[PDB]
């Protein structure tokens, strides 16, 4: 009745942010005057470190304090992040906003744990799917709004950032009076083949997060971002719509998975690597846009399948206890690969080269997972 509507409106107004599609074009513009090397190699890598640091503390804080204060914390973190994007000028200030965005992403778990904590035991997946769909629709509508406003009204990215601050303010106001849960999930004390799909999910989502962290900066290299020649809002709206319809198509089609799940996963990883190589090698911005859509759709198929083979035979209380470990492994892998690749203390690689590395990473994951299926040679050779 009431708590679900409050959470739905909070999620919609939090996710609806026209600033995010045009972030690096706004950061690498006259408003901030930040070179691409600075954002690529000093500012953005801080997000992965902040998220990895804050994952587990936020994970236990959500459980301990009954999931509402962490939602208000995410709201005030949104407030601070977008206020400091609106009124911040400096590499250190942008590292701070990256830390606060990592805090936002870490605290996002509360928005979904509160759902299980407050809804009736009769069903959880229905309201969880509605909440996820409302967040996705909010993001898509925000991207389309940003694209339309930029294209028609000639409206600067400062005004879009203002709109995002207003939206997150309304979201925080809505999260102010969420009813309190009366129970926690595992505030008490705490198959082997699941290790396969856990590794699949961890590696694929580490690659996806690291790719998304720098897709826009790659778009910046092909065409002048500070000009109006870019189409980030429409492109990212189409990308998230394609990802959503792709994740739904996996449920629309009901095929056996215990037989060809690994084959589907390796095929999708191969397509991911191909899309990344298309992004890296091409010279046209539209080819990179199409590669982004293809990669997002293929990764969404891959992760929908991987989450199915983890969640079919898992308890609802163990869903969180397993996905927390899986995303911790994913963040460990992403932080290691970022320190080796992106961070200035490592190789200081421009985004014009990072995407070859990402495509090779996906290709190597697919190849090694196929090679682990080495039992083909032993049985066939008799
Ligand atoms: C306003 C702002 C401030 N700091 C950041 N840092 C940042 C940029 C790109 C990132 O890659 C996404 C990695 N994973 C993070 C969550 C899902 C994907 C992660 C962090 N992004 C910002 N906007 C933004 C730009 C491009 C993509 C994203 S997002 O994918 O992470 N946003 C959601 C779709 C998850 C809502 C957000």
UniProtKB/Swiss-Prot annotation:
Activity vs pH: Optimum pH is 7.5.
Protein name (record): Thiamine transporter 2
GO MF entry, a single one: thiamine transmembrane transporter activity
Keywords: Disease variant, Glycoprotein, Membrane, Transmembrane, Transmembrane helix, Transport
Residue ranges, Cytoplasmic side: 63-69, 120-132, 254-258, 313-321
Membrane topology label: Multi-pass membrane protein
Residues the record marks as site: Essential for pyridoxine transport: 74-75, 79, 81-82, 156, 161
Activity modulation comment: Pyridoxine transport is inhibited by carbonyl cyanide p-trifluoromethoxyphenylhydrazone (FCCP) and carbonyl cyanide m-chlorophenylhydrazone (CCCP).
One GO-annotated biological process of the protein: thiamine transmembrane transport
Annotated phenotype, changing residue 75 to V: Significant decrease in pyridoxine transport
Entry-linked SUPFAM superfamilies: MFS general substrate transporter
Gene: SLC19A3
Top-level division of the source organism's lineage: Eukaryota
Location of the protein in the cell: Membrane
Cited function: Mediates high affinity thiamine uptake, probably via a proton anti-port mechanism. Has no folate transport activity. Mediates H(+)-dependent pyridoxine transport.
Positions of glycan attachment: 33, 154
Catalyzed chemical reaction(s): thiamine(out) + H(+)(in) = thiamine(in) + H(+)(out); pyridoxine(out) + n H(+)(out) = pyridoxine(in) + n H(+)(in)
Extracellular compartment spans: 17-41, 91-98, 154-157, 220-232, 280-291, 343-350
GO cellular component, one term: plasma membrane
Tissue: Widely expressed but most abundant in placenta, kidney and liver.
Effect of residue 74 to H: Significant decrease in pyridoxine transport
Classification via Gene3D superfamilies: MFS general substrate transporter like domains
Pathological condition linked to this protein in its record: Basal ganglia disease, biotin-thiamine responsive: An autosomal recessive metabolic disorder characterized by episodic encephalopathy, often triggered by febrile illness, presenting as confusion, seizures, external ophthalmoplegia, dysphagia, and sometimes coma and death. If untreated, encephalopathies can result in permanent dystonia. Brain imaging may show characteristic bilateral lesions of the basal ganglia.
InterPro entries on file: Folate_carrier (IPR002666), MFS_trans_sf (IPR036259), ThTr-2 (IPR028337)
């Amino acid at each position: 009745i009431y708590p679900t509507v409050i959470l739905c409106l909070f999620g919609f107004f939090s996710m609806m942010r026209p600033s995010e599609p045009f972030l690096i074009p706004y950061l690498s513009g006259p408003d901030k005057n930040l070179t691409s090397a600075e954002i690529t190699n000093e500012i953005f890598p801080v997000w992965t470190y902040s998220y990895l640091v804050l994952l587990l503390p936020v994970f236990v804080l959500t459980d301990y304090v009954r999931y509402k204060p962490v939602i208000i914390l995410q709201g005030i973190s949104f407030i601070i992040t977008w206020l400091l994007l609106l009124f911040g000028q400096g590499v250190k200030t942008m590292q701070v906003v990256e830390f606060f965005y990592g805090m936002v992403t870490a605290a996002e778990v509360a928005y979904y744990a509160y759902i299980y904590s407050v809804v009736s035991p009769e069903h959880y997946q229905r309201v969880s799917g509605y909440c996820r769909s409302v967040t996705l629709a909010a993001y898509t509508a925000g991207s389309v709004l940003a694209q339309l406003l930029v294209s028609l009204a000639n409206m600067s990215y400062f005004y879009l950032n203002v709109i995002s601050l207003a939206s997150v303010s309304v979201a925080f106001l809505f999260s102010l009076f969420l009813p309190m849960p009366k129970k926690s999930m595992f505030f008490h004390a705490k198959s082997k083949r699941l290790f396969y799909w856990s590794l699949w999910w961890a590696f694929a989502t580490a690659g996806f997060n690291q790719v998304l962290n720098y897709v826009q900066i790659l778009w910046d290299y092909k065409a002048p971002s500070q000009d109006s020649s870019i189409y980030n809002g429409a492109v990212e709206a189409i990308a998230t719509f394609g990802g959503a319809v792709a994740a739904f198509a996996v449920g629309y089609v009901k095929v056996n998975w215990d037989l060809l799940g690994e084959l589907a996963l390796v095929v999708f990883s191969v397509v991911n690597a191909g899309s990344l190589f298309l992004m890296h090698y091409t010279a046209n911005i539209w080819a990179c846009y199409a590669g982004y859509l293809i990669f997002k759709s293929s990764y969404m198929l891959l992760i929908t399948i991987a989450v199915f083979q983890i969640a079919v035979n898992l308890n609802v209380e163990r869903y969180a206890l397993v996905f927390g470990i899986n995303t911790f492994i994913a963040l460990v892998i992403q932080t290691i690969m970022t320190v080796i690749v992106v961070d200035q203390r490592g190789l200081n690689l421009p985004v014009s080269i990072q995407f070859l590395v990402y495509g090779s990473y996906f290709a190597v994951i697919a190849g090694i997972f196929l090679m682990r299926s080495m039992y083909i040679t032993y049985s066939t050779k008799s």
